[PDB]
Design a protein around this ligand. Sequence first.
Ligand code: HEC
Ligand code: HEC
Ligand code: HEC
Ligand code: HEC
Ligand SMILES: [Ca+2]
Ligand SMILES: [Ca+2]
Ligand code: NA
Ligand code: NA
Ligand code: NA
Ligand code: NA
Lengths: 125, 125, 355, 354, 376, 376
Amino acid sequence: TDPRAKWVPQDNDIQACDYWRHCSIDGNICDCSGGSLTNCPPGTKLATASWVASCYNPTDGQSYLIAYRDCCGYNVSGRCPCLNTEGELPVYRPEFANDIIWCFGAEDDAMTYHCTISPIVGKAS
Amino acid sequence: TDPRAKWVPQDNDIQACDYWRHCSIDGNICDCSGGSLTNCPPGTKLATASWVASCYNPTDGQSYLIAYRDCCGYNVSGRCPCLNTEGELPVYRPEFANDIIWCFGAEDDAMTYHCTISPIVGKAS
Amino acid sequence: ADDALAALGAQLFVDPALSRNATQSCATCHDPARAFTDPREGKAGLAVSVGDDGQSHGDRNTPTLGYAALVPAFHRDANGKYKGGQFWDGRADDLKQQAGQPMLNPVQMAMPDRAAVAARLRDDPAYRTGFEALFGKGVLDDPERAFDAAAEALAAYQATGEFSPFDSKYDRVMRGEEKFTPLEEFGYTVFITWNCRLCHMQRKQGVAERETFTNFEYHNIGLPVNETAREASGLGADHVDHGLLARPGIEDPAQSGRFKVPSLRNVAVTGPYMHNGVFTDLRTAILFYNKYTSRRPEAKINPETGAPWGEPEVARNLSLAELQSGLMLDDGRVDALVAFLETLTDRRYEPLLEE
Amino acid sequence: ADDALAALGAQLFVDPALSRNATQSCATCHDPARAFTDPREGKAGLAVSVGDDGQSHGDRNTPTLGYAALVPAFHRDANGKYKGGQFWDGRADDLKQQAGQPMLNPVQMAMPDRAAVAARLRDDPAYRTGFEALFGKGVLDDPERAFDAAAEALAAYQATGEFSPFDSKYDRVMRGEEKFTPLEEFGYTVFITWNCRLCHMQRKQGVAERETFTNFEYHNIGLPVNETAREASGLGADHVDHGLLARPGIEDPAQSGRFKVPSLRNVAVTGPYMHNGVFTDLRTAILFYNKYTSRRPEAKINPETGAPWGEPEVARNLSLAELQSGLMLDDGRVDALVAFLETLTDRRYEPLLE
Amino acid sequence: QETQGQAAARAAAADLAAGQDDEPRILEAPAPDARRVYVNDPAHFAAVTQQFVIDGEAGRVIGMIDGGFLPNPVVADDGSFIAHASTVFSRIARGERTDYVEVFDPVTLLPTADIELPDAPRFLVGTYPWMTSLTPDGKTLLFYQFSPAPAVGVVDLEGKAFKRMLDVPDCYHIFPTAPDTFFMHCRDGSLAKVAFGTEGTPEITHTEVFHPEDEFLINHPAYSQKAGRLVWPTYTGKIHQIDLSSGDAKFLPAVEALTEAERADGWRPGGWQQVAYHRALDRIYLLVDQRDEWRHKTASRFVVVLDAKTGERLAKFEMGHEIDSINVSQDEKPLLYALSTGDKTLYIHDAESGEELRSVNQLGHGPQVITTADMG
Amino acid sequence: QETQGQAAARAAAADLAAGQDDEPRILEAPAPDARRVYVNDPAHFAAVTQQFVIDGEAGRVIGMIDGGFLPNPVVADDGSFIAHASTVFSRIARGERTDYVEVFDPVTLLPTADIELPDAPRFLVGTYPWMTSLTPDGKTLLFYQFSPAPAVGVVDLEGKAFKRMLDVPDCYHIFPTAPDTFFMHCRDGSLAKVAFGTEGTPEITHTEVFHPEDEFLINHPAYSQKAGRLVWPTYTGKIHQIDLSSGDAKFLPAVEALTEAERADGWRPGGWQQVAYHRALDRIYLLVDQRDEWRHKTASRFVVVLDAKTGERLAKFEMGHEIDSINVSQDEKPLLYALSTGDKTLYIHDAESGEELRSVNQLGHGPQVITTADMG
Ligand code: HEC
Ligand code: HEC
Ligand code: HEC
Ligand code: HEC
Ligand SMILES: [Ca+2]
Ligand SMILES: [Ca+2]
Ligand code: NA
Ligand code: NA
Ligand code: NA
Ligand code: NA
């Protein structure tokens, strides 16, 4: 709860904003509106695009690529809001930018933002 | 601040929920979104319908009839929310009921609730 | 002056000598026993009045003189709303300007001119004494002076408490001397929360000192022609009553079909209703307003004839913003409103209310 | 043991005695100097390969044998997607069932039957020794056991280190031994965040131990017919390649037009591209994906022809959900993907990149 | 004592360590059961709104449903679907109005129907459960209209079509009792029974008047469609009970939720859904607190529990939060649900002992309406 | 001392006592002036949003405008009109997408144009003022598209119609310099100048690369169309200045908003609208605080003010609140506007001394963007 202090990751609770995989999340944790860490809630639509970040995992000391994907087609969840920005770059480097609504590829052309999932898609580097 | 306490009217600040004319208001005070105590904000539409209440004026000891009228066609203002129910009766006595959106007769068929005004229409009887 | 000028006007008010054939006074058409309205049946019932010649009918219903002294003189307010005046179309500025006009109007008292009126006044020694005491010697020898003084006396008389007593049940209840029945109370609640109050209350907000249940504005509510009255008047099946636009000096086409909002005081005893006397029953006048708000078939139908209300005489400039309230009056609310409007009856006419 | 089995398969692999006129071995089409693909120029370029008869051409491009050992045995998964197997249509279950079929294919090596194979095996004293040492005395006298044993040896050979060394630059960067260049890291970032990774990564999520840049699934990406190859195959221009639907026992019409996702390892040196070798150049392969995403005129045009791509050979069961990404790759991103894919080249073929 | 967020961290970490794959995808919510509870958020009159689908047993959000301006939610008792009547505009809160009913699948939450209501016929009011109602067979949705006059709209959910408006007398609320019948509460202090068809003036029959003009019946009565029991508190905690199980109204003896001494010391009901009824127990639950008489929409901190037959008080629970609405699950050992508009939090209590068991926060901007299915 | 609500009660009591009548009516806002300020609430990505129009002198809301999902507000420097590009859906957050431009009268707040944008072309992103942009003449509105590729839409406000999209290269933001010309910022480090006649490809010309790969330019620079000063801070607090007043780009001396020591001890810009530029005074204003390098979007409690010609610091203010965005009035003795997303409150400061004068609270759910008109 010091906002300007270096972000301290934890691996014990996925609903809180300091969970290690949320290091560059912008919005809401889908685990808090009926999805899960890596799945969308019912009635929403899973985008295919993603911004990515290398998030340090305090547990095994390894860095993993989290490819954030949005669940779209609902109004914002309003539960478990978080904005982190580890390694986050301005819009002109979109692959690393998180103000952008990554709902591209979602079924039914869904582009409204409900929440975001935090899957590992790789090792850093 | 005791919410269950008998309400105590004042005649010194129209933006506060204990202002005497707001004794059966439900919504938001129009004065707080560019209206005034008795006028709607720009871009909204003034209903012709109302609900009424007898509100004691502590400046002069008289009770007045306040015919609340809504300003409609905009999303709820979100400023100066208030809910009072002096003399307020259930829905089947609609002239005294304040959960109903009193937007009837507004220009352009506007029925969304934005805020409410508090004009006097008579002395109490 | 005060008492004496009113008392002179009391004598003129009742004096048939101001009509050509001397059959007719103010009081003939403005009968004090019927809230200063005309009880006489003519070729169109009580809708329009019969003049001194026994034959001619007017085209407009004879209104009450009660509370008329509360209306401001004619003017345009800064909103651009015309306000006040006398006659249903406001063509007289005030009571004094209005008073001489039924004397010279051939369809009413029918005196040929001012000198003829002056001649009648000169013949009564009580008028010679009363007129000269107030307006100076030889007043009755100058036709323009005599006519103007007579108008003045008459205006004064209509300004007395006799005309505006404020002793209705509503007045008593507002002073805390009695209380409304639950029905009357519901009627008042309805009147002040529904569209009635948009036109039939003096003020847009705040409290009036001497409420007369009109804002004195001009509105076209879209009434049809009263065909039997219009036939009796003889003005022609092609004739259009333009309301306010008929006031000389008003040229604005948007004023066509608009009429002065009447005071609802004594309304229960001054039937029939509207400027052409088109509705017999107070209830019907109330139900008229549902044509603009109700989706039901019956709301298109004048319950007195079994047929549609009818096409407006003037189908433009209707007060649609006020009239299209989006809420219909159910029968319980009409009843309540009838109850309430009955409390606006002055004490002396309370006995008239049974019938 | 398994050493000897694969050592036997290493012999068979380069032996033209397994072709009717003895003009070609597995290595003729799957050239080790070319990441186990065919260098030779036939009637339709390098799009399809020429059999033992000197004239017959196939209808499909010869694929690399690198990393093919990592592919699981053909199966239908719990989500009802087919996965794994061998050949572009998965018609062979695994490497063992696949190995026999070039020997007997008349448009390829063109041996008449298992007996002619056994007969040719039995003519070599080294095979009599090597085979009888692993499978028992007389195994070459039974055509069925002999053919099966040769298929085993070849499958074992294809599963050695040599075919799957994991020594690409990509592998070295994942072990922390070097770093991508800026362009290469941009391309990798783009590869895992664009739609590529929905198909060309082993897992949906997590990290794979031995990534081969394919999820082993079957997809119709809407490719046109390759006109000169189809002509050289002589299968007739009324012919339709139905992909997985051609696997015996697949019946579901939703599988028509779908092919196995190729591993992208060595992709930079195994041109031409796709099941029918339609695109000579890697960058054209990348750009094909823009036809489903980009507004621009040039996205309809195959830069190799200057003409529209062509209608899909099979105009149904297109993987639209994956392909209609809503985002077009600009030149800079196509550039960066080329660089990243170049880093999937095994060490020994880095000299081929030019 | 291990929270759901912690349990999920522990499981994701095991998966990552075991190298366990899994495809990112759209979840189905768990099968509807008795401990599913819906919370609607009218968001203090905002133009768009949310409903949260919550597993009461776990205290976990399992889904959401978006809505428009002051929608009316319904839930089929049998659990086969949910629906709402809702209202949108072409430019947020301005321009062309479209009123419509959606039916949704209770596990995918996908709309299985979207039925336009002609001529913007919905009643726009702070949300009252019994202004939109399902018939017991789940085939028909009934919605109140106020303007231009009281009427009831008939929507055929099976054929997915608006059928008709019914004219009714000067009455309010809609309590269905049969595929073609419902009751309303009338200004005159009667109930009206309304028996309708596809056309024709409906058969409208009034009961006896059951209360004086000056007892005020609250806007949020409890009604158990399965029991045919209508539980109607007044402003003083006096409770009317009407038995409609026979298809006709029968008036049960009135009970007092508060004692005479409580009432003399200022105890009154207050809130939004100030009453709940548990059908299998035949128990009534009432939100009460010490308050001035005209503070009847304020939160309360106490629930009294009374036997519906005798009016005997069974418990008085100190809720320990500012509670605006209550309801109960309809299973044995029911939960008592206590929703705070102010805290935007559903507190879930053991209804026998009153003990707070768990809670679900972050439930929108002004959540007010708790709905459960009676699946028993 | 007397608040607006109190002064309001005194006036209304005097009208009552004096019997003054007055007609309930729709107000007009006052004439746009230099102290008028607009605050946009993207509402943490809610499907509907609000703009508050504020008299900064009195610290009084004088109007509001509704928007849809992540609208882009613009304000005509001359005060002639305001506009936004906005996005709605047929069923709150789902169904058919409509992107449109509305123009409003700036005193009635009535829409004067509603121009539909074909094929849902808007870039949906947390709100950046220079992703949608008026030409200096106010006849043309230009909006950024990211999908399927960077492009720029041209909307004719005079004719009230969409015109066409322009193909651009891999560039971001839109800074209009004339009726037919705008600059963007490109991935490769250059600026791109885009000149478009009515047809064909636009003529596109790059500057040199003016910053490196490792140097990160914020999403919210400040651009004064009237001065043609583009003011672009980086993550460290270094500030790029590009003059565009000649119609071509000319790079002014780079400058540093923080001292080498302050960087060393943790001082960095951070927030949303981290930078403001006052044209008359030629003076830059920069939200900064002590923070880690990847906490660039968090609130900052300090503002520094420095000369744009020289680089010299003129003041450092402790704002006394958590501030996300800043801007300034463009008149003499400007106001410094300090917007807190977390407090939903606009703090209004004397820009000369940094003292807080007044404030405006309850500005929605997550207010982030301040716009002012430059009218002198
Ligand atoms: C033949 C019947 C008749 C007689 C006699 C008559 N009036 Fe009238 N009076 C009417 C009619 C009819 C109207 C409405 C006329 C119109 O609007 O054009 C009217 C209107 C008025 C009004 C206007 C009131 C209002 O609310 O608009 C006043 C004042 C008035 N009369 C006073 C008098 C006086 C004074 C006399 C005697 C000098 C008089 N009347 C004689 C029939 C009569
Ligand atoms: C648009 C303003 C307006 C509104 C709203 C309106 N009235 Fe009127 N009312 C009038 C006008 C004007 C007349 C005169 C019409 C005419 O004769 O042309 C009138 C006439 C009447 C009369 C007949 C009076 C007489 O002496 O002839 C009654 C009764 C009446 N109104 C009652 C009501 C009631 C009750 C309501 C509420 C349902 C109501 N009005 C709403 C303007 C209004
Ligand atoms: C005349 C050229 C030719 C020769 C000789 C040949 N192949 Fe192939 N190979 C191909 C073609 C063409 C395909 C793809 C055919 C298809 O998909 O139906 C292929 C496919 C394969 C595959 C499956 C690869 C994948 O990713 O699906 C394996 C394994 C294989 N060959 C191994 C061999 C072995 C072992 C030999 C020696 C017995 C051999 N090949 C001889 C041309 C040849
Ligand atoms: C729907 C899943 C899918 C997606 C997404 C996809 N691919 Fe492919 N890719 C395939 C399939 C299947 C083939 C083989 C197609 C065929 O030959 O019929 C293929 C073939 C290729 C080839 C030629 C390989 C060879 O050996 O012939 C390259 C290069 C390639 N893809 C790159 C990409 C890139 C880069 C992306 C991201 C832009 C991409 N693909 C996206 C499924 C996919
Ligand atoms: Ca009359
Ligand atoms: Ca190839
Ligand atoms: Na008639
Ligand atoms: Na005229
Ligand atoms: Na070819
Ligand atoms: Na088959």
